[PDB]
Amino acid sequence: CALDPLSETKCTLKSFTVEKGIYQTSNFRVQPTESIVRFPNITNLCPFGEVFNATRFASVYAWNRKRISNCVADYSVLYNSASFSTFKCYGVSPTKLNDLCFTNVYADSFVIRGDEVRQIAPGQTGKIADYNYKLPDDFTGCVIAWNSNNLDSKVGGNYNYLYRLFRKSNLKPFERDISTEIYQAGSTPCNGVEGFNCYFPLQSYGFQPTNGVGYQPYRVVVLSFELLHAPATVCGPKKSTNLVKNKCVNFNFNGLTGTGVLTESNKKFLPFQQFGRDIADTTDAVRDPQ
């Protein structure tokens, strides 16, 4: 089918004899000459140590969210390390994280138990999900968890770690409450520390060194990637090649991984927008990161 155009015509018609006429055999496409990768001039490594190497993780009721931005993030070392028992990515692929660029990455760190580790997932129902930490239905990112029994378990129990047990209403996704107001239930007779059908909202739990694996403390860090609709600030460890125009290339603008020929534009992008789409929702204009 590629020897000569007559043979391509014979292949298309599925016959070795063709009649007089003009036949639409195949399509002609200009193959790219080179591959272009253009990532921003950020060079400093991301402070992922301060999230995973943390001495103590914040409690689930009041977790810690860190703004990871303006740095080069290497997720290959995070995924390749065998320390993390659970490494589940929902909207992305863990091995594809080095080729992508994100405008902002947020890491939420908290400690839960083995029986509640499955509750950290989109569309889940449970104590942690309903009252402590709710993940969005359209959650894109990765969930990282590893055993902290060697880290947080103490003889007699570790009482620095708190989970909410009672709340008036379920939490919307990414909702944190630190009210610590006493729980009022029943006929609402509790206005103080203790009352009828009244309990403390923050139910502490102590982690024993010999406790069961399901009740062992688990350090959980979730990376909430928000994909590329604004200019990127945190990117993978991909080298940036020189920009070439007027030649068909496999351009990779902040992970856009398109293909086409690049020309100078007279279109004025607003400062907050970095991409330009069209009717078919295909990227028409891009702003060079460098």
Epitope: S153, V155, G156
Partner: antibody
């Protein structure tokens, strides 16, 4: 009272291992971390590593991640570091401090200081 | 890896005055600085925990303030026993790091 015993002024030939002794008493040994700090004469303190006596979990500094290896004896409530290749530059004071974990992490109690020198 | 620096590496003070040190971290930590002192031929001793509150047995002159990245150590009154080496220690995440070094002069 709480007292941490640490002998010092030990003489060792360069290129040989040392077995530091860090005897601690006066507190529950399973509820507190104990750490080591290296200080050159006239220079700032430099971290070495930590340990969990209950679960024998250790973290090492990047410079000392392979040279210094740490072990703990729960029976004698004494921590140790050993199997290191000392050099002439390694001559420094080696402290042993108790890390107050599960609470205000403050390095509450410090040792006298093992002034190891080599020649 | 969090890095700490002190601009006043060596400081000269007079008895009875107030001075303040500085310790800025590479990354924000949120009050995870402990200030230590080491006298000549002595051992380090904890003075101020979490860079904000103090402990028992420490004179009230040693006052700590600061949050985020930049931290400071303030001493109300200077006497003969205040001449030592004051060190800044970050404890937010491993590896734990100590200060470059601050010295006091008469």
């Amino acid at each position: 009272q709480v007292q941490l015993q640490q002998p010092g002024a030990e003489l060792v030939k360069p290129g040989a291992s040392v077995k530091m002794s860090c005897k601690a008493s006066g507190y529950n040994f399973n509820h507190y971390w104990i750490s080591w700090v290296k200080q050159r004469p006239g220079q700032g303190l430099e971290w070495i590593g930590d340990i969990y006596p209950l679960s024998h979990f250790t973290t090492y500094n990047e410079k000392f991640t392979n040279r210094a290896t740490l072990t703990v004896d729960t029976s004698s409530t004494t921590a140790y570091m050993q199997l290191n290749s000392l050099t002439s530059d390694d001559s420094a004071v080696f402290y042993c401090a108790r890390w107050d974990y599960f609470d205000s992490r403050t390095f509450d109690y410090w040792g006298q200081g093992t002034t190891l020198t080599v020649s | 890896d969090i890095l700490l620096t002190q601009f006043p590496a060596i400081l000269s003070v007079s008895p009875g005055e107030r001075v303040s040190f500085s310790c800025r971290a590479s990354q924000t930590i949120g009050t995870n600085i402990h200030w230590y002192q080491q006298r000549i031929n002595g051992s380090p001793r904890l003075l101020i925990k979490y860079a904000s509150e103090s402990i028992s047995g420490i004179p009230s002159r040693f006052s700590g303030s600061g949050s985020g990245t930049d931290f400071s150590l303030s001493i109300n009154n200077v006497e003969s026993e205040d001449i030592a080496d004051y060190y800044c220690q970050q404890i937010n995440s491993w590896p734990l790091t100590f200060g470059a070094g601050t010295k006091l002069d008469l």
